[PDB]
Design a protein around this ligand. Structure first.
Ligand SMILES: CC(=O)S[C@@H]1CC2=CC(=O)CC[C@]2(C)[C@H]2CC[C@@]3(C)[C@@H](CC[C@@]34CCC(=O)O4)[C@H]12
Length: 431
Protein backbone atom coordinates (compact mmCIF):
# COMPACT_ATOMS: atom_id res chain seq x y z
CA UNK A 1 0.00 0.00 0.00
CA UNK A 2 2.13 2.86 -1.31
CA UNK A 3 -0.87 5.16 -0.85
CA UNK A 4 -0.56 4.73 2.92
CA UNK A 5 3.10 5.75 2.62
CA UNK A 6 2.00 8.78 0.58
CA UNK A 7 -0.41 9.75 3.37
CA UNK A 8 2.36 9.24 5.93
CA UNK A 9 4.71 11.46 3.90
CA UNK A 10 2.05 14.17 3.63
CA UNK A 11 1.97 14.55 7.43
CA UNK A 12 5.43 16.21 7.81
CA UNK A 13 4.62 18.53 4.90
CA UNK A 14 1.58 20.29 6.36
CA UNK A 15 2.63 19.86 10.00
CA UNK A 16 6.40 19.20 10.15
CA UNK A 17 7.08 22.92 10.70
CA UNK A 18 6.85 22.12 14.42
CA UNK A 19 10.00 19.97 14.27
CA UNK A 20 11.84 21.70 11.42
CA UNK A 21 11.06 25.27 12.45
CA UNK A 22 11.42 25.14 16.24
CA UNK A 23 12.62 28.22 18.09
CA UNK A 24 15.38 27.60 20.67
CA UNK A 25 16.13 29.81 23.65
CA UNK A 26 18.39 32.32 21.90
CA UNK A 27 20.22 35.54 22.77
CA UNK A 28 22.60 38.03 21.20
CA UNK A 29 26.02 36.56 20.38
CA UNK A 30 28.30 39.05 22.12
CA UNK A 31 32.01 38.67 21.28
CA UNK A 32 34.25 38.63 24.33
CA UNK A 33 31.93 36.46 26.42
CA UNK A 34 34.17 33.51 25.54
CA UNK A 35 37.15 35.45 26.92
CA UNK A 36 35.29 36.08 30.18
CA UNK A 37 34.33 32.40 30.38
CA UNK A 38 37.98 31.46 29.88
CA UNK A 39 38.93 33.91 32.64
CA UNK A 40 36.39 32.26 34.97
CA UNK A 41 34.45 29.19 33.88
CA UNK A 42 30.88 29.78 35.03
CA UNK A 43 27.96 27.55 34.10
CA UNK A 44 25.85 28.37 31.02
CA UNK A 45 23.00 29.42 33.31
CA UNK A 46 25.41 31.83 34.99
CA UNK A 47 26.43 32.97 31.50
CA UNK A 48 22.83 33.87 30.65
CA UNK A 49 22.39 35.49 34.07
CA UNK A 50 25.51 37.68 33.79
CA UNK A 51 25.43 38.48 30.05
CA UNK A 52 21.90 38.26 28.60
CA UNK A 53 19.58 41.06 29.79
CA UNK A 54 16.90 39.84 32.15
CA UNK A 55 13.29 39.27 31.22
CA UNK A 56 10.77 42.08 31.52
CA UNK A 57 8.64 42.54 34.63
CA UNK A 58 5.51 41.52 32.67
CA UNK A 59 7.17 38.42 31.22
CA UNK A 60 8.58 40.24 28.18
CA UNK A 61 11.44 38.15 26.77
CA UNK A 62 12.12 40.56 23.87
CA UNK A 63 14.63 42.61 25.88
CA UNK A 64 16.81 39.52 26.35
CA UNK A 65 16.16 37.47 23.23
CA UNK A 66 16.95 40.34 20.83
CA UNK A 67 19.21 42.76 22.73
CA UNK A 68 22.79 42.84 23.97
CA UNK A 69 24.95 45.03 26.22
CA UNK A 70 27.49 47.56 24.96
CA UNK A 71 29.84 47.06 27.93
CA UNK A 72 33.24 45.95 26.64
CA UNK A 73 34.10 42.34 27.46
CA UNK A 74 37.76 42.20 26.40
CA UNK A 75 38.66 45.10 28.71
CA UNK A 76 37.43 46.05 32.19
CA UNK A 77 36.53 42.40 32.84
CA UNK A 78 38.20 42.08 36.25
CA UNK A 79 34.87 41.41 37.97
CA UNK A 80 33.46 37.92 37.46
CA UNK A 81 30.76 37.46 40.12
CA UNK A 82 28.79 40.45 38.78
CA UNK A 83 30.58 42.22 35.90
CA UNK A 84 27.49 44.29 35.04
CA UNK A 85 27.18 45.67 38.58
CA UNK A 86 30.60 47.33 38.37
CA UNK A 87 29.81 48.88 34.97
CA UNK A 88 26.55 50.45 36.18
CA UNK A 89 24.42 50.42 39.32
CA UNK A 90 21.25 49.85 37.27
CA UNK A 91 21.12 47.25 34.51
CA UNK A 92 18.75 49.40 32.43
CA UNK A 93 21.28 52.25 32.26
CA UNK A 94 23.60 50.23 30.02
CA UNK A 95 23.02 50.54 26.25
CA UNK A 96 21.00 47.75 24.62
CA UNK A 97 21.85 47.34 20.95
CA UNK A 98 20.62 44.67 18.54
CA UNK A 99 22.09 41.25 17.74
CA UNK A 100 24.69 42.60 15.33
CA UNK A 101 26.79 39.41 15.16
CA UNK A 102 24.05 36.77 15.18
CA UNK A 103 22.51 34.55 17.85
CA UNK A 104 23.36 31.60 20.10
CA UNK A 105 20.63 28.93 20.07
CA UNK A 106 20.46 26.64 23.10
CA UNK A 107 19.74 23.30 21.43
CA UNK A 108 22.14 20.52 20.37
CA UNK A 109 20.31 20.13 17.04
CA UNK A 110 19.50 22.56 14.26
CA UNK A 111 16.31 24.21 13.05
CA UNK A 112 15.12 26.46 10.25
CA UNK A 113 14.93 29.28 12.80
CA UNK A 114 18.45 28.43 13.97
CA UNK A 115 19.82 28.08 10.43
CA UNK A 116 18.26 31.07 8.66
CA UNK A 117 18.07 33.22 11.84
CA UNK A 118 14.28 33.62 11.82
CA UNK A 119 14.20 35.49 15.13
CA UNK A 120 13.30 38.98 16.35
CA UNK A 121 12.60 41.21 13.31
CA UNK A 122 12.66 38.15 11.03
CA UNK A 123 10.37 36.08 13.28
CA UNK A 124 7.51 36.58 10.80
CA UNK A 125 9.51 34.66 8.20
CA UNK A 126 8.82 31.49 10.17
CA UNK A 127 5.15 32.36 9.62
CA UNK A 128 5.87 32.91 5.93
CA UNK A 129 7.30 29.37 5.91
CA UNK A 130 3.82 27.90 6.50
CA UNK A 131 1.91 30.64 4.67
CA UNK A 132 3.84 29.81 1.49
CA UNK A 133 2.92 26.14 1.89
CA UNK A 134 -0.77 26.99 2.25
CA UNK A 135 -0.74 29.46 -0.66
CA UNK A 136 0.85 26.59 -2.57
CA UNK A 137 -1.99 24.29 -1.47
CA UNK A 138 -4.52 26.80 -2.82
CA UNK A 139 -2.88 27.55 -6.17
CA UNK A 140 -2.10 23.87 -6.67
CA UNK A 141 -5.69 22.91 -5.92
CA UNK A 142 -6.64 25.21 -8.80
CA UNK A 143 -3.78 24.23 -11.11
CA UNK A 144 -3.93 20.45 -10.79
CA UNK A 145 -7.66 20.53 -11.50
CA UNK A 146 -6.92 22.69 -14.54
CA UNK A 147 -4.07 20.47 -15.77
CA UNK A 148 -5.51 16.99 -15.10
CA UNK A 149 -7.23 16.80 -18.50
CA UNK A 150 -4.11 18.06 -20.29
CA UNK A 151 -1.85 15.07 -19.53
CA UNK A 152 -4.33 12.52 -18.18
CA UNK A 153 -5.03 11.29 -14.68
CA UNK A 154 -1.87 9.14 -14.40
CA UNK A 155 0.96 11.05 -16.07
CA UNK A 156 -0.05 14.18 -14.16
CA UNK A 157 -0.17 12.20 -10.91
CA UNK A 158 3.29 10.74 -11.52
CA UNK A 159 4.69 14.16 -12.41
CA UNK A 160 3.21 15.76 -9.29
CA UNK A 161 4.57 12.99 -7.05
CA UNK A 162 8.01 13.33 -8.66
CA UNK A 163 7.94 17.11 -8.19
CA UNK A 164 6.90 16.66 -4.55
CA UNK A 165 9.75 14.25 -3.83
CA UNK A 166 12.34 16.30 -5.73
CA UNK A 167 11.16 19.52 -4.07
CA UNK A 168 11.50 17.94 -0.63
CA UNK A 169 14.95 16.50 -1.35
CA UNK A 170 16.20 19.82 -2.76
CA UNK A 171 14.59 21.49 0.26
CA UNK A 172 16.96 19.42 2.38
CA UNK A 173 19.82 21.16 0.50
CA UNK A 174 18.41 24.69 0.25
CA UNK A 175 21.21 27.29 0.50
CA UNK A 176 19.16 30.29 1.67
CA UNK A 177 15.66 31.11 2.85
CA UNK A 178 14.39 32.25 -0.56
CA UNK A 179 15.03 28.83 -2.12
CA UNK A 180 13.51 27.34 1.04
CA UNK A 181 10.29 29.29 0.46
CA UNK A 182 10.26 28.52 -3.28
CA UNK A 183 10.53 24.78 -2.58
CA UNK A 184 7.79 25.13 0.05
CA UNK A 185 5.60 26.79 -2.58
CA UNK A 186 6.24 24.04 -5.15
CA UNK A 187 5.70 21.29 -2.57
CA UNK A 188 2.42 22.90 -1.52
CA UNK A 189 1.38 23.19 -5.16
CA UNK A 190 1.87 19.47 -5.81
CA UNK A 191 1.28 17.82 -2.43
CA UNK A 192 -2.41 18.59 -1.90
CA UNK A 193 -3.14 17.26 -5.37
CA UNK A 194 -1.07 14.17 -4.56
CA UNK A 195 -3.04 13.50 -1.37
CA UNK A 196 -6.43 14.09 -3.00
CA UNK A 197 -5.54 11.88 -5.97
CA UNK A 198 -4.36 9.13 -3.64
CA UNK A 199 -7.63 9.34 -1.73
CA UNK A 200 -9.61 9.21 -4.99
CA UNK A 201 -7.74 6.12 -6.19
CA UNK A 202 -8.06 4.38 -2.82
CA UNK A 203 -11.81 5.13 -2.77
CA UNK A 204 -13.05 4.57 -6.32
CA UNK A 205 -10.81 1.68 -7.40
CA UNK A 206 -11.71 -0.52 -4.42
CA UNK A 207 -15.46 -0.01 -4.89
CA UNK A 208 -15.35 3.15 0.90
CA UNK A 209 -15.44 4.12 4.58
CA UNK A 210 -12.91 1.45 5.56
CA UNK A 211 -10.25 2.50 3.05
CA UNK A 212 -10.83 6.17 3.93
CA UNK A 213 -10.39 5.62 7.67
CA UNK A 214 -7.30 3.53 6.91
CA UNK A 215 -6.06 6.52 4.91
CA UNK A 216 -6.39 8.84 7.91
CA UNK A 217 -4.78 6.12 10.05
CA UNK A 218 -1.88 6.20 7.59
CA UNK A 219 -1.71 9.98 8.08
CA UNK A 220 -1.61 9.54 11.87
CA UNK A 221 1.07 6.85 11.55
CA UNK A 222 3.00 9.36 9.47
CA UNK A 223 2.65 11.91 12.27
CA UNK A 224 3.93 9.35 14.80
CA UNK A 225 6.86 8.47 12.53
CA UNK A 226 7.58 12.19 12.14
CA UNK A 227 7.77 12.50 15.92
CA UNK A 228 10.08 9.49 16.10
CA UNK A 229 12.35 10.78 13.32
CA UNK A 230 12.50 14.26 14.85
CA UNK A 231 13.57 12.61 18.11
CA UNK A 232 16.18 10.48 16.33
CA UNK A 233 17.30 13.15 13.83
CA UNK A 234 17.65 16.55 15.56
CA UNK A 235 18.94 18.62 12.66
CA UNK A 236 16.26 19.89 10.29
CA UNK A 237 18.32 18.97 7.22
CA UNK A 238 18.46 15.32 8.30
CA UNK A 239 14.75 15.22 9.15
CA UNK A 240 13.73 16.88 5.88
CA UNK A 241 15.92 14.53 3.83
CA UNK A 242 14.68 11.45 5.72
CA UNK A 243 11.06 12.52 5.23
CA UNK A 244 11.46 13.31 1.53
CA UNK A 245 13.37 10.11 0.72
CA UNK A 246 10.47 7.63 1.36
CA UNK A 247 8.12 9.11 -1.25
CA UNK A 248 11.07 9.48 -3.65
CA UNK A 249 12.25 5.86 -3.42
CA UNK A 250 8.61 4.67 -3.41
CA UNK A 251 -19.37 26.43 -12.26
CA UNK A 252 -18.63 28.98 -9.53
CA UNK A 253 -22.12 30.52 -9.74
CA UNK A 254 -23.90 27.16 -9.37
CA UNK A 255 -23.17 27.14 -5.61
CA UNK A 256 -24.38 30.67 -4.81
CA UNK A 257 -27.40 31.33 -7.05
CA UNK A 258 -30.32 30.04 -5.00
CA UNK A 259 -30.64 30.94 -1.30
CA UNK A 260 -30.66 27.23 -0.43
CA UNK A 261 -27.23 26.51 -1.92
CA UNK A 262 -25.83 29.94 -1.02
CA UNK A 263 -26.44 29.52 2.72
CA UNK A 264 -25.16 25.93 2.74
CA UNK A 265 -22.04 27.00 0.83
CA UNK A 266 -21.46 29.83 3.32
CA UNK A 267 -21.80 27.45 6.27
CA UNK A 268 -19.49 24.83 4.76
CA UNK A 269 -16.87 27.42 3.80
CA UNK A 270 -16.91 28.81 7.33
CA UNK A 271 -16.71 25.33 8.87
CA UNK A 272 -13.73 24.34 6.72
CA UNK A 273 -11.97 27.64 7.44
CA UNK A 274 -12.63 27.48 11.18
CA UNK A 275 -11.61 23.85 11.67
CA UNK A 276 -8.50 24.16 9.51
CA UNK A 277 -7.51 27.23 11.54
CA UNK A 278 -8.24 25.38 14.79
CA UNK A 279 -6.23 22.29 13.83
CA UNK A 280 -3.19 24.14 12.50
CA UNK A 281 -3.25 26.73 15.29
CA UNK A 282 -3.50 24.05 17.97
CA UNK A 283 -0.50 22.26 16.45
CA UNK A 284 1.47 25.52 16.23
CA UNK A 285 0.51 26.48 19.80
CA UNK A 286 1.80 23.07 20.89
CA UNK A 287 5.04 23.71 19.03
CA UNK A 288 5.49 27.21 20.46
CA UNK A 289 4.38 26.61 24.06
CA UNK A 290 4.88 23.01 25.22
CA UNK A 291 8.21 22.10 26.79
CA UNK A 292 7.55 18.41 26.08
CA UNK A 293 7.10 18.77 22.34
CA UNK A 294 7.96 15.20 21.35
CA UNK A 295 5.78 13.48 23.95
CA UNK A 296 2.95 16.01 23.57
CA UNK A 297 2.91 15.48 19.80
CA UNK A 298 2.99 11.70 20.24
CA UNK A 299 0.08 11.86 22.70
CA UNK A 300 -1.94 14.09 20.37
CA UNK A 301 -1.39 11.70 17.46
CA UNK A 302 -2.35 8.75 19.66
CA UNK A 303 -5.54 10.65 20.56
CA UNK A 304 -6.21 11.34 16.87
CA UNK A 305 -6.10 7.54 16.55
CA UNK A 306 -9.41 6.82 18.39
CA UNK A 307 -11.04 10.04 17.19
CA UNK A 308 -11.70 8.48 13.79
CA UNK A 309 -13.18 5.38 15.44
CA UNK A 310 -15.43 7.53 17.63
CA UNK A 311 -16.57 9.50 14.58
CA UNK A 312 -17.24 6.28 12.65
CA UNK A 313 -19.31 4.95 15.55
CA UNK A 314 -21.27 8.19 15.93
CA UNK A 315 -22.09 8.68 12.24
CA UNK A 316 -23.68 5.22 12.21
CA UNK A 317 -26.07 6.05 15.08
CA UNK A 318 -26.04 9.70 16.19
CA UNK A 319 -25.82 11.26 12.73
CA UNK A 320 -23.57 13.84 11.10
CA UNK A 321 -24.85 17.33 11.96
CA UNK A 322 -25.34 16.74 15.69
CA UNK A 323 -21.88 15.23 16.46
CA UNK A 324 -20.24 18.01 14.43
CA UNK A 325 -21.67 20.69 16.74
CA UNK A 326 -20.62 18.74 19.84
CA UNK A 327 -17.08 18.21 18.52
CA UNK A 328 -16.67 21.85 17.45
CA UNK A 329 -17.96 23.02 20.84
CA UNK A 330 -15.55 20.61 22.54
CA UNK A 331 -12.60 22.05 20.61
CA UNK A 332 -13.69 25.62 21.34
CA UNK A 333 -14.26 24.89 25.03
CA UNK A 334 -10.86 23.19 25.31
CA UNK A 335 -9.22 26.24 23.72
CA UNK A 336 -11.12 28.52 26.11
CA UNK A 337 -10.18 26.48 29.19
CA UNK A 338 -6.49 26.36 28.24
CA UNK A 339 -6.42 30.15 28.70
CA UNK A 340 -7.12 29.80 32.43
CA UNK A 341 -4.69 26.92 33.04
CA UNK A 342 -1.80 27.98 35.26
CA UNK A 343 1.68 27.48 33.74
CA UNK A 344 2.57 25.07 36.56
CA UNK A 345 0.03 22.48 35.42
CA UNK A 346 1.14 20.35 32.47
CA UNK A 347 -0.83 17.12 32.79
CA UNK A 348 -4.13 19.00 32.66
CA UNK A 349 -2.78 21.06 29.76
CA UNK A 350 -1.95 17.98 27.69
CA UNK A 351 -5.25 16.29 28.63
CA UNK A 352 -7.23 19.33 27.45
CA UNK A 353 -5.12 19.56 24.29
CA UNK A 354 -5.88 15.89 23.61
CA UNK A 355 -9.61 16.48 24.12
CA UNK A 356 -9.52 19.47 21.77
CA UNK A 357 -7.61 17.56 19.10
CA UNK A 358 -10.03 14.63 19.37
CA UNK A 359 -12.87 17.11 18.88
CA UNK A 360 -11.15 18.59 15.82
CA UNK A 361 -10.57 15.09 14.43
CA UNK A 362 -14.23 14.11 14.82
CA UNK A 363 -15.40 17.45 13.42
CA UNK A 364 -13.28 17.05 10.28
CA UNK A 365 -14.53 13.48 9.87
CA UNK A 366 -18.11 14.72 9.70
CA UNK A 367 -17.13 17.77 7.61
CA UNK A 368 -15.85 15.56 4.81
CA UNK A 369 -19.04 13.48 4.71
CA UNK A 370 -21.41 16.45 5.04
CA UNK A 371 -19.57 18.40 2.36
CA UNK A 372 -19.89 15.37 0.09
CA UNK A 373 -23.58 14.86 0.91
CA UNK A 374 -24.88 18.47 0.80
CA UNK A 375 -24.33 19.05 -2.93
CA UNK A 376 -25.93 17.61 -6.09
CA UNK A 377 -24.05 15.31 -8.46
CA UNK A 378 -22.90 18.00 -10.91
CA UNK A 379 -21.92 20.70 -8.37
CA UNK A 380 -20.36 18.43 -5.72
CA UNK A 381 -16.85 18.77 -7.14
CA UNK A 382 -17.13 22.57 -7.34
CA UNK A 383 -18.48 22.78 -3.79
CA UNK A 384 -15.72 20.57 -2.39
CA UNK A 385 -13.09 22.56 -4.30
CA UNK A 386 -14.30 25.96 -3.05
CA UNK A 387 -14.67 24.68 0.52
CA UNK A 388 -11.10 23.34 0.43
CA UNK A 389 -10.10 26.70 -1.06
CA UNK A 390 -11.42 28.44 2.06
CA UNK A 391 -9.67 25.76 4.11
CA UNK A 392 -6.40 26.78 2.43
CA UNK A 393 -7.20 30.47 3.02
CA UNK A 394 -7.55 29.65 6.71
CA UNK A 395 -4.25 27.78 6.53
CA UNK A 396 -2.58 30.86 5.02
CA UNK A 397 -4.04 33.11 7.72
CA UNK A 398 -3.31 30.80 10.66
CA UNK A 399 0.48 31.27 11.17
CA UNK A 400 0.30 35.07 10.90
CA UNK A 401 -2.11 35.12 13.83
CA UNK A 402 -0.81 32.21 15.96
CA UNK A 403 2.79 33.42 16.07
CA UNK A 404 1.98 37.16 15.95
CA UNK A 405 -0.75 37.56 18.58
CA UNK A 406 1.45 35.72 21.09
CA UNK A 407 3.85 38.66 20.81
CA UNK A 408 0.96 40.82 22.04
CA UNK A 409 -0.74 38.32 24.36
CA UNK A 410 -0.01 34.59 24.57
CA UNK A 411 -3.68 33.92 25.43
CA UNK A 412 -5.06 35.92 22.47
CA UNK A 413 -4.68 33.16 19.83
CA UNK A 414 -6.46 30.81 22.23
CA UNK A 415 -9.24 33.37 22.75
CA UNK A 416 -9.68 33.68 18.99
CA UNK A 417 -9.68 29.89 18.62
CA UNK A 418 -12.34 29.58 21.32
CA UNK A 419 -14.51 32.23 19.66
CA UNK A 420 -14.15 30.50 16.29
CA UNK A 421 -14.92 27.09 17.78
CA UNK A 422 -18.07 28.14 19.63
CA UNK A 423 -19.24 30.18 16.63
CA UNK A 424 -18.74 27.17 14.34
CA UNK A 425 -20.55 24.91 16.82
CA UNK A 426 -23.51 27.29 16.88
CA UNK A 427 -23.43 27.73 13.10
CA UNK A 428 -23.37 24.04 12.15
CA UNK A 429 -26.81 23.62 13.76
CA UNK A 430 -28.37 25.48 10.80
CA UNK A 431 -27.69 22.70 8.26
C1 LIG B 1 -4.14 20.46 8.52
C2 LIG B 1 -5.56 19.91 8.28
O1 LIG B 1 -6.45 20.66 8.05
S1 LIG B 1 -5.86 18.26 8.37
C3 LIG B 1 -4.84 17.30 7.50
C4 LIG B 1 -4.44 18.01 6.19
C5 LIG B 1 -5.45 17.83 5.04
C6 LIG B 1 -6.08 18.75 4.38
C7 LIG B 1 -7.06 18.29 3.30
O2 LIG B 1 -8.11 18.83 3.11
C8 LIG B 1 -6.62 17.08 2.48
C9 LIG B 1 -6.19 15.95 3.42
C10 LIG B 1 -5.67 16.35 4.81
C11 LIG B 1 -4.30 15.67 4.87
C12 LIG B 1 -6.41 15.83 6.02
C13 LIG B 1 -6.71 14.33 5.88
C14 LIG B 1 -7.59 13.82 7.01
C15 LIG B 1 -6.94 14.16 8.35
C16 LIG B 1 -5.68 13.31 8.48
C17 LIG B 1 -6.55 15.63 8.45
C18 LIG B 1 -6.04 15.63 9.88
C19 LIG B 1 -7.24 15.00 10.62
C20 LIG B 1 -7.80 13.97 9.61
C21 LIG B 1 -9.30 13.81 9.87
C22 LIG B 1 -9.39 12.95 11.13
C23 LIG B 1 -8.27 11.93 10.95
O3 LIG B 1 -8.26 10.79 11.26
O4 LIG B 1 -7.17 12.75 10.26
C24 LIG B 1 -5.60 15.97 7.30
Amino acid sequence: LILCLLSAAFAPICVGIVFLGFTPDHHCQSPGVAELSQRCGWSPAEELNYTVPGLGPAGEAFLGQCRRYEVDWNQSALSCVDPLASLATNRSHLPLGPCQDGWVYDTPGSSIVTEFNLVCADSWKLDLFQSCLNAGFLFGSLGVGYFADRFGRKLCLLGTVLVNAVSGVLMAFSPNYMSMLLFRLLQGLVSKGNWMAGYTLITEFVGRRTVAIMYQMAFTVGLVALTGLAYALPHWRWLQLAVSLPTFLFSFADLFRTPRLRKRTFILMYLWFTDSVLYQGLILHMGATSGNLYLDFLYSALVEIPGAFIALITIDRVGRIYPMAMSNLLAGAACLVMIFISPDLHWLNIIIMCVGRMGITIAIQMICLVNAELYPTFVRNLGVMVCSSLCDIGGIITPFIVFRLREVWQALPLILFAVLGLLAAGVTLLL
